[PDB]
């Protein structure tokens, strides 16, 4: 069921016009396309390419002066058996009291007998987050020292190896949510924003969670303001009784507020080899990446 979002949840863009104009003109299309190209390789957990993609993410952010921790652990999967998973946790201020967290998964789904590239799922999301760090590096500098800072979290082992279920899915997220819960490190997450299945044409977004509906409406407003300045995806509706499972689930279950940036319906190529370079709509990709960059600045800088 879709419900119209009530007025109480409206939360318009607050950046001054000049800063909104200035920040909305920051981009690096070439870097975004280069990041996509680097990441868009088969990258099943435990493979050489999986390590190559992790190294690229880690080095890219370390080169931009982010603190980067790799959370490594072993778990058992159907088919593959024992695997070494590696969540990537990048922060501007590793000593922050609070974080906005932007996140996605960097593994690609294991598909017997075929290469699966997972362009929308989630090579493009991963590239959008690296590109965000590159494009906004000047504006983000103060967040290296502030009490509220930014974390980019690249989950490992999101995908099932045999059949999606509670014991065969979201390996990295389940591990990390349990670890941080045990360590009292979940309360510091203001909100976990999860990007998934982005880069295909004509995505439609809805608000899934009432406690983040107001911040959903800030993204909606960012999109409206960009349109007005002539520079739609986010619907002003909430989807109730939606039970879409993803990396956020183990955080959601432990009281962490979630903003789930995933289109409904999913792209038509979902979990087929057609989720490749050819499905990427670059106009939609540049657009969504810009909207997300501005959302991050709205939240963090205000
Ligand atoms: C085909 O369209 C759908 C298919 C499945 C579901 N239901 C669930 S619970 N999906 C969890 C997806 C986990 N995931 C995310 C990226 N790679 C894997 C909903 C769909 O449309 C609303
Ligand atoms: Cl490989
Ligand atoms: Zn998937």
- Residue the block writes with tokens 């689930």: 249
Each as own residue / partner, the long-range contacts of residues 113-117 (CB below 8 Å, 24 or more positions apart, any chain) are: 114/273, 115/42, 115/273, 116/42, 116/271, 116/273, 116/275, 117/40, 117/41, 117/42, 117/273, 117/275, 117/276, 117/277
Retrieve residue 285's tokens.
């990709």
Retrieve residue 161's tokens.
């190896």
- 288 Cβ contact partners less than 8 Å away, ≥ 6 residues apart: 128, 198, 199, 203, 233
User: Phi/psi class of residue 255: alpha, beta or left (left: φ > 0; alpha: ψ in -120 to 50)?
Assistant: left
- Contact status, residue 290 vs residue 231, Cβ threshold 8 Å: yes
User: Which letter does DSSP use for residue 175 in this model?
Assistant: H
- The residues carrying an active-site annotation are 158, 196
Experimental method: X-ray
Retrieve residue 15's tokens.
């950046």
Side-chain-facing half-sphere of 139: CA atoms under 13 Å: 23
Point out the ligand nearest to the CA of residue 45. 2
Give 243-276 as a 3 state SS string. CCCCCCHHHHCCCCCEEEECCCCCCCCCCCCCCC
Cα 35 to chain center, whole Å?
Answer: 15
CA dist., res. 264 & res. 277, Å (int): 21
CA dist., res. 165 & res. 11, Å (int): 36
CA dist., res. 245 & res. 158, Å (int): 10
In order of 12, 207, 298, the CA distances from 7 in angstroms are: 11, 14, 20
Please name which of 149, 110, 134, 125 lies closest in space to residue 60, comparing C-alpha atoms.
134
End-to-end Cα, the chain, rounded Å: 33
- At 65, is the secondary structure helix, strand, or coil? coil
CA dist., res. 229 & res. 223, Å (int): 10
Question: Which protein residues have a CB closer than 5 Å to ligand 3 (ion)?
Answer: 121
Point out the ligand nearest to the CA of residue 46. 2
- Contact status, residue 85 vs residue 75, Cβ threshold 8 Å: yes
Question: Is 271 part of any known ligand binding site?
Answer: yes
For ligand 1, atom 7, name the residue with the nearest CA. Answer: 244
For ligand 1, whether the C-beta of 107 sits within 6 Å is: no
CA dist., res. 277 & res. 39, Å (int): 11
- Contact status, residue 55 vs residue 63, Cβ threshold 8 Å: no
- Residue the block writes with tokens 């362009």: 119
DSSP readout, 83-107?
A: EEEEEEEEES-TT-SEEEEEEEE--
Cβ burial 47-75 (10 Å sphere, 16+ → b, else e): eeebeebbebbbebbeebebbbeebebee
For ligand 1, whether the C-beta of 245 sits within 6 Å is: yes
- Contact status, residue 157 vs residue 106, Cβ threshold 8 Å: no
Retrieve residue 69's tokens.
């921790």
Q: Set out the domains of the chain in order of their start, with CATH numbers.
A: 1-302 (3.40.630.10)
CA dist., res. 65 & res. 144, Å (int): 9
For ligand 1, whether the C-beta of 79 sits within 6 Å is: no
CA dist., res. 146 & res. 96, Å (int): 7
- Residue the block writes with tokens 């290469």: 115
Residue 54 phi/psi, 5° resolution? -60, -50
Question: Is 121 part of any known ligand binding site?
Answer: yes
- Determine the atom of ligand 1 nearest the C-alpha atom of 242: 22
For ligand 1, whether the C-beta of 204 sits within 6 Å is: no
For ligand 1, whether the C-beta of 229 sits within 6 Å is: no
For ligand 1, atom 1, name the residue with the nearest CA. Answer: 266
Compute the distance from residue 48 Cα to the ligand 2 centre, in Å: 4
How many degrees, rounded to 5, is the angle at CA 291 between CA 288 and CA 292?
A: 85
Can you give the resolution of this entry in Å?
Answer: 1.6
CA dist., res. 61 & res. 248, Å (int): 23
CA dist., res. 81 & res. 7, Å (int): 50
Point out the ligand nearest to the CA of residue 117. 3
For ligand 1, atom 14, name the residue with the nearest CA. Answer: 246
Side-chain-facing half-sphere of 99: CA atoms under 13 Å: 25
- At 194, is the secondary structure helix, strand, or coil? strand
Residue to probe by mutation, ligand 1, list 195, 198, 245, most atoms within 8 Å of CB = 245
Q: How long, in residues, is the chain?
A: 302
Number of CB atoms found within 10 A of residue 35's CB: 23
Compute the distance from residue 244 Cα to the ligand 1 centre, in Å: 6
Handedness of CA 156, 40, 276, 294 (dihedral sign): positive
């Amino acid at each position: 069921e879709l419900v119209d979002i009530p007025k109480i949840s409206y939360n318009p863009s607050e950046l001054s016009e000049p800063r909104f104009l200035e920040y909305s003109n920051l981009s690096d299309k070439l870097h975004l396309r280069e990041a996509i190209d680097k990441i868009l390789i088969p990258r099943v957990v435990g493979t050489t390419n999986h390590s190559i993609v992790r190294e690229y993410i880690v080095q890219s952010l370390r080169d931009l002066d982010w603190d980067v921790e790799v959370n490594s652990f072993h778990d058992h999967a159907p088919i593959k058996g024992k695997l070494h998973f590696h969540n990537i946790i990048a922060t501007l201020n590793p000593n922050a009291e609070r974080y906005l967290v932007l996140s996605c998964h960097y593994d690609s789904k294991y598909m017997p007998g075929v290469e699966f590239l997972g362009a929308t799922d989630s090579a493009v999301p991963c590239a959008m987050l690296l590109n965000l760090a590159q494009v906004l590096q000047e504006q983000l500098k103060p967040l290296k020292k502030s009490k509220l800072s930014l974390m980019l979290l690249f989950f490992d082992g999101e995908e099932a190896f045999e059949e999606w279920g509670p014991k065969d899915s979201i390996y990295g997220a389940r591990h990390l949510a349990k670890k941080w819960h045990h360590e009292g490190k979940l309360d510091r997450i203001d909100m976990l924003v999860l990007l998934d299945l982005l880069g295909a044409p004509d995505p439609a977004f809805y608000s899934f969670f009432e406690n983040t509906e107001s911040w959903y409406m800030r993204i909606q407003s960012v999109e409206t303001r960009l349109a007005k300045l002539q520079l739609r995806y986010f619907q002003s509706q909430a989807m109730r009784s939606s039970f879409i499972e993803d990396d956020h689930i183990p955080f959601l279950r432990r009281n962490v507020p979630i903003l789930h940036l995933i289109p409904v319906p999913f792209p038509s190529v979902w979990h087929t080899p057609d989720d490749n370079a050819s499905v990427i709509d670059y106009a939609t990709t540049d657009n969504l990446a810009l909207i997300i960059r501005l959302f991050a600045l709205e939240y963090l800088l205000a």
